[PDB]
Ligand binder design. Sequence first.
Ligand SMILES: *Cc1c(COP(=O)(O)O)cnc(C)c1O
Ligand SMILES: *Cc1c(COP(=O)(O)O)cnc(C)c1O
Ligand SMILES: *Cc1c(COP(=O)(O)O)cnc(C)c1O
Ligand SMILES: *Cc1c(COP(=O)(O)O)cnc(C)c1O
Ligand SMILES: *NCCc1c[nH]c2ccccc12
Ligand SMILES: *NCCc1c[nH]c2ccccc12
Ligand SMILES: [Ca+2]
Ligand SMILES: [Ca+2]
Ligand SMILES: [Ca+2]
Ligand SMILES: [Ca+2]
Ligand SMILES: [Ca+2]
Ligand SMILES: [Ca+2]
Ligand SMILES: [Ca+2]
Ligand SMILES: [Ca+2]
Lengths: 476, 490, 490, 476
Amino acid sequence: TFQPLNADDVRSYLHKAVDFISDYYKSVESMPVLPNVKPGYLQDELRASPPTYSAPFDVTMKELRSSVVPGMTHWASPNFFAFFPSTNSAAAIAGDLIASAMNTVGFTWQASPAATEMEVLALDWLAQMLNLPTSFMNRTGEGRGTGGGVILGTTSEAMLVTLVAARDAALRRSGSDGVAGLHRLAVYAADQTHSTFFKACRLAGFDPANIRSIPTGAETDYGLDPARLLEAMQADADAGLVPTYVCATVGTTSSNAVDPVGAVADVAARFAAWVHVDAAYAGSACICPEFRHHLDGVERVDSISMSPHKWLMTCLDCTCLYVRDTHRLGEVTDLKDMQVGVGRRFRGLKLWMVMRTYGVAKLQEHIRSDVAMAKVFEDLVRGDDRFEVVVPRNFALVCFRIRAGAGAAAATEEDADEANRELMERLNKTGKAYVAHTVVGGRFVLRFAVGSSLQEEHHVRSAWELIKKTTTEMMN
Amino acid sequence: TFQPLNADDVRSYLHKAVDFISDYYKSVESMPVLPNVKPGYLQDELRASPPTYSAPFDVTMKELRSSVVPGMTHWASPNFFAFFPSTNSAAAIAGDLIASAMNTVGFTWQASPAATEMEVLALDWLAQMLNLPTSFMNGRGTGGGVILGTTSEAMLVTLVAARDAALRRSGSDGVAGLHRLAVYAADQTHSTFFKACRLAGFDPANIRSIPTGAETDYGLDPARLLEAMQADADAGLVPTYVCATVGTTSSNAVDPVGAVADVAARFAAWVHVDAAYAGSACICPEFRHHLDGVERVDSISMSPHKWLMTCLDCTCLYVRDTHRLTGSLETNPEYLKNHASDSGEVTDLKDMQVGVGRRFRGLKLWMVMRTYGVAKLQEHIRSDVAMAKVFEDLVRGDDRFEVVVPRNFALVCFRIRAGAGAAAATEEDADEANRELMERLNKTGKAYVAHTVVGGRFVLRFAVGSSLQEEHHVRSAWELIKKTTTEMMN
Amino acid sequence: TFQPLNADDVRSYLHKAVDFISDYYKSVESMPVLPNVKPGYLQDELRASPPTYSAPFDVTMKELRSSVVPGMTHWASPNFFAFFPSTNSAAAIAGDLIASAMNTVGFTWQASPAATEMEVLALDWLAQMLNLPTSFMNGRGTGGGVILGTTSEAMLVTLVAARDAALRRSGSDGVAGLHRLAVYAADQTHSTFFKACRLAGFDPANIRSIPTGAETDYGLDPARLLEAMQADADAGLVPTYVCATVGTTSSNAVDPVGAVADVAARFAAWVHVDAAYAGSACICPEFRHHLDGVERVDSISMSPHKWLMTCLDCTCLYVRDTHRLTGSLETNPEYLKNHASDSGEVTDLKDMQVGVGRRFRGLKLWMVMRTYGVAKLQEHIRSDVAMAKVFEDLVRGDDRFEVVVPRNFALVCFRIRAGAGAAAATEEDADEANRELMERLNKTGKAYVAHTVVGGRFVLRFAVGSSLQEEHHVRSAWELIKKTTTEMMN
Amino acid sequence: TFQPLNADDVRSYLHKAVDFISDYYKSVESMPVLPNVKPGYLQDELRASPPTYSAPFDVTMKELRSSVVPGMTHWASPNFFAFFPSTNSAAAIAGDLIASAMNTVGFTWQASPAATEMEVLALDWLAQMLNLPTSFMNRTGEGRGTGGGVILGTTSEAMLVTLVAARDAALRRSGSDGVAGLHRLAVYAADQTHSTFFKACRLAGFDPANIRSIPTGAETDYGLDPARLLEAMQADADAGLVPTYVCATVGTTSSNAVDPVGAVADVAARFAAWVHVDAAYAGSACICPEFRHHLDGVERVDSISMSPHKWLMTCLDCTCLYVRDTHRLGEVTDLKDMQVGVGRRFRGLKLWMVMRTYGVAKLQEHIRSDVAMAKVFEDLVRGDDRFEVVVPRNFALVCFRIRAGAGAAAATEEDADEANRELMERLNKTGKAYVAHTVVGGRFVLRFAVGSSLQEEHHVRSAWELIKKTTTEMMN
Ligand SMILES: *Cc1c(COP(=O)(O)O)cnc(C)c1O
Ligand SMILES: *Cc1c(COP(=O)(O)O)cnc(C)c1O
Ligand SMILES: *Cc1c(COP(=O)(O)O)cnc(C)c1O
Ligand SMILES: *Cc1c(COP(=O)(O)O)cnc(C)c1O
Ligand SMILES: *NCCc1c[nH]c2ccccc12
Ligand SMILES: *NCCc1c[nH]c2ccccc12
Ligand SMILES: [Ca+2]
Ligand SMILES: [Ca+2]
Ligand SMILES: [Ca+2]
Ligand SMILES: [Ca+2]
Ligand SMILES: [Ca+2]
Ligand SMILES: [Ca+2]
Ligand SMILES: [Ca+2]
Ligand SMILES: [Ca+2]
């Protein structure tokens, strides 16, 4: 007699969830962004064992309010300035709600034709927004493309599955008996490429000795030097190793550096190496013509990924992987085999709803207005001699720091490192900001990632006032 | 001025979504479980290109109802009988909705303390329901767990940990020795295990698919496993990892976990238990014996998004030594550093998975257990098992049919017997008669049945438990099987 | 390589269209006659821009069913009771389909001889059914006819011919004298007549709307017309054209054609008879008296696309002297010259209309008469009249209501009487009660009723004859009126 | 008991009509394009009076086959080369079939919301295809335009209603008491503008003395000289007359001349005169970028019309009128009042179906392939010294003639006039062509209008062979 999807519970539980969400967005700014809890706090609030009997959903919701919410970091806060914002939208939430309720598993087209076709559709649509070549598209206006896509959970998963494909292709090219020649394969990326990529390399079975982190410096604004790449790949080829894969990043995590995609593709072409472009964050901006040059040369690379669940208003998970000329690996299917596990939820519905409800023009103005707020902040930092913008701002992330010589409490560059750490910690104690750091050229640097979905320009200006106020109180 | 999370839209879009969900559940039984669409229909109806301008959300919902829903296979239908049902609940849907709205990314504990602490709590609660040994929970314990999206990822990361330890202790020169490692699973083990082996760099020649047969009800014969492992060792290979399945995908065979563990311990091989579907049953004491010996394995996974009313994605992995996983999976990039991670007192769950980011998946799982309670979760397992028993006994009382293997949970494997009619004299005729019966059942729209092969024989699976499905749906499906069969014989 | 008329597409698109039409007629009664859509819904659903690429016609038909049909007011519904019904037939639809496919443009006889000769034949056949004087047909006759799209165009071209003759004979200096010309119609004459006067350059101060009242059942009083014309003449104006209506749009009043003609003949004014709706009834001998005196008028029009089962557009204009029309309307451009036109033996129908091109509209009208015959067309008029009489007598037997004027054809004008209940004590209350009754009836979706004003009183029209409508639809609509009324009183 | 729309008749009558149409298109080429009937033939075939009783539809269809079809001029023939082709499509026919069956009258939005909204939609869509300014559009992507459109029956109706609006506006500007000053208003067009325009002028009440036909000559390829226009409009203004309206034609009927729209608009702006652009035939080509310059300046004119029922595959009737800044004359309505009679059929459904089924790209290639066939013919004529192409070909119409001096039977220019007339008559007697003529610069000229929907390139080449054969047999 127990019906977990009975009509009354479904409507009343979801209505209570929706009420919570409405209130949460209306009040999240009034909360401290970073919570004031210590590890282990939750087990001192909630019972240690699952309850034997059922409770009213109201009891569950009040434990969510009393014990969960106060322990969260509010990514949705307009004063969240860390990492990259997980931008979101009413359409994306509604689409994921509907996918959760239908709860289909699309491991084949037959297991749900609409789910597979919508994932292909959403991928082909976004490929058009990015102005990708037809070689990355499944369906075309009248016919078929020569490429394909799949909606994965993470950029790391995108890296792994393209690493595996490149691995097996190089093993065949080099006459390996199975994996016996795996120790001859080498892989390459700039040292600013995310550390999860080198981890993916190790997961795929590449030898630690042949995984190359190419040093970058400020003379290229920490983008990969194609000459240093060629030098490293040639030396490996000369020594009997097989250059197998290069990851180029458009918009690195630490400082939003940009690797030159076309130059990297040409250098890798000397060795028939696979080239993957990681544009997890900044890829979203490339739907705008004034950012699309960052992907020039993508037509010569083998794969590209970007994550709408960062900067395209689509809640997690949504990472889009595109692969060129898929025939080296009618029926309308995504590349379900370039996926850690086939057998996961209908991720495509929310991405389609985002594009269909808002349209390309609003998606582009969402990018442009975030960039404009980032420029407002960058220009405020540049107007205060106590600070410096440590690298050029390419998108909506600004890297800045208190200079050495700003005050007597920042006399040496070691002093400045400590002052910037103290500033970041003071900002986070106010509850009116969440700032985290990185290291650029040996220096402790504050990141300022503009774009939390609820955040408006006055929030950024107010954050800057707070940075000025806090610095001033520190320096005397 | 464009505000994607403005209060008006958030409320009305979600209310329109809830109205759709309400209607959908009320009307899904009356739709055909399988659609009647051709490949490529969707881009025909929606367009080839995204719109330049915006549209009211009512339009999006209209295209959902008009173009998406008619192309769906309705997993939620009470007449969906294939694969394993994706059981679901109002609480799980509500939890995932709230997690989607808060949309926190919990790669570290600091990135959102409650997201990681609730996941740990939820895993611990499920471990208690499962009566897992305390060595899988977390004093001095090394045990621990992670929610992942899939069994495949759970297989992948334990394969990688086993691989790295084998290469290290066997003196591999980097990965030059990877071609020496060997892995084992019964031939009834899900195909994604063999795929995860290939992902991790294991050599295809060294991935052992151990034959099984009716002698063990297609469970893994431990003597045959010992034979295969010893032979590899004698040949200079390194036996590295064994996968045991409790509740196989095809016929719900159960591998003897304890004896597999004892055999593999002669080689210090990693033992993982895949209980993706049947693990949820083990919250019931009459099924917990299928996990006896888990106290001697290295890892076990099961998916609440199959049989524990928690919408996809939700797969729970438990390990006896988290340090063996984080050794292979951890990173320490500068931009993620924080005092809590430095202190060693928290586990950053990015170090238990492939990726960095992750959703707040603990919320839905906790909401399911917190709202419904153990007793209701147990009765949910039991009532599905009883419905499947009803169907099993119906099949048994009709001499044209046979139950192909013993029924351990809520999947019945059955077949039109050989010699049941003039259109099934041979076994080759029965093979074709069962395929005809399956295609006919699906064509009515009042069933979705898919097949498997059990010992060379074409077999129909009847997987009970779709959340909206009641006993009368199962009885009516049997009547539909009988009547379709009778019409096929003459 | 793109072939818009390839055989495969022509056949399958049209078969899909016929299937839609079949379904539409079978299901239209079950839709609400009036839609429930907001202004602007369509571009929301279809997009703001045309697609770059092609789509299967099945997609076009799907958007027809999903987005167009739900926004329609269903003229074809048996419960459509407003305006005048657009009566239709399988033969007329088939005729227009074939004309659309052959898609000839018949500006001259040579441009397609059969298109013009069948139009002449069809007009002649209808003139016979109407028992028009032979002076309207074509020996030595000057009479003749043209099929036009609208009564408005028929009004326009006869206004222009009358205008040009008045200016010529009254000694206008070019069009300097146009402000001296005057035109007359009863105030019950359709608003498009006064619009056509303005199009032709008549002065708004000189366009006479003669008052009518209950004394003549709102027909034009010829003494009041003579008064208005004589007064204008005495003042130096030139009475130029009079329009008489047989079957007015509001209440189906009938102007006395003979006496209007005799009054206008004292001034040599052009007399046109507008019988757009009721002219089709005059194929029945018991209605032909409404046209007595047509033998003395200059022109008469009526629209088979109202009450003669010929889908829009189809309006027939007859004149006693085609030369008075072609004098104003003809052109002789060089590229259209041909021997048949030069010979004077054919009438190029571009010289009887505003435009150059024209469809083969004679085909549908001829197919209707040829397939069904006069007797069936007569019985079609009579059965509609009898259904309207049924409704009229129902209204009469209920003391809360009144029939407002005598019923001449198949339109009943009725009203909630003053003093019928406590919510209709005054006439101002009855005016509001009838508007409430009308809005309620339409809200049910089982009726579409619209109103008119008869002698300062808010009145409901009940226009019988929608082609799918049977007597039980009329009886059920009366029951719906009674029950809606009763619920309104308390 | 007689149901004219009973289900059996509807299906069987329409199926017989569809069978007829299928056969007709398959066999129309085998018929003589021009029929061999004399005036009055039909009344000698069919009964003189309507039948008293009903007959089976088969009887009706067989009279269509026996007596109607043999008397038709087959506009649908691939060998129809006259006037302008009435191009057509399966989608347009299906849409008009469906409109005929629904049979709604859309004189208000409420009388059928979908019909009005679809007419506005189809107009706004085609305006985008023509790249008309927003000032001619009803709805915009996110908001509203400042203009509007209406789907009329004819170009003449478009002329009349814009003439009326311009007339009443000039009467108010000039202080006229009603129509008392109508004799002061003057109107203008080149002498190549269709004669139905000067007729429309007379219908609207303009004085014959003030209706101006501006002479054109070969020095402008018979396009209107803007200087001659200004000279005529200035002289009228100087004399006390009120210049009220100018019609500019893009693609004249006789020779497809093109009036300079922008220059004409600027000249008319001196006098505040209304400017209408008639592009009945050639307007359809302006959905292609390489023809769109012909409409340069449309942004400064008051109205523009073109007819999809000529060159955009939409069966009659379909003439689209657009009016700029409609506020000088929410709710979504066409300009139903700029229409001779409000109260006509749902013309919009077939135009939408054409655009939705085939898409912009196929509509453009339909224009380009007709033009290409026209160029093939033009180049064949130019390769034979006995002929001349008398004006430049702008679209898919070619004007050509046998020269004087071609043979001894074409020695004087009067002889050539008679030889071209004899050629045209011989071509039409074969039944394998329908050619009609015009006069250009005092000379008898053959028109050759490419584009009948069934016509392919071999049909045009074969017509040229026939012209060569026939000329040769004439000249000896
Ligand atoms: C369903 C099932 C799986 C599915 O694995 P995923 O990676 O989650 O797609 C694996 N193993 C078993 C036994 C199953 O029943
Ligand atoms: C966010 C980020 C990642 C992390 O990706 P996951 O989805 O967590 O695997 C990788 N690369 C870049 C450039 C990133 O910004
Ligand atoms: C319906 C009707 C009209 C309609 O005129 P149109 O120009 O065809 O729209 C005119 N007069 C009368 C009496 C009518 O009943
Ligand atoms: C076809 C044509 C016309 C004739 O228009 P109608 O629709 O018959 O009134 C007018 N002008 C031009 C340029 C034409 O080609
Ligand atoms: N260092 C990674 C930051 C990150 C990882 N996954 C993510 C998803 C969404 C926003 C940010 C993010
Ligand atoms: N001289 C006019 C030719 C013409 C007039 N109306 C038409 C419609 C369709 C094609 C040609 C045409
Ligand atoms: Ca923003
Ligand atoms: Ca809108
Ligand atoms: Ca650590
Ligand atoms: Ca159940
Ligand atoms: Ca297609
Ligand atoms: Ca003549
Ligand atoms: Ca009737
Ligand atoms: Ca063509």
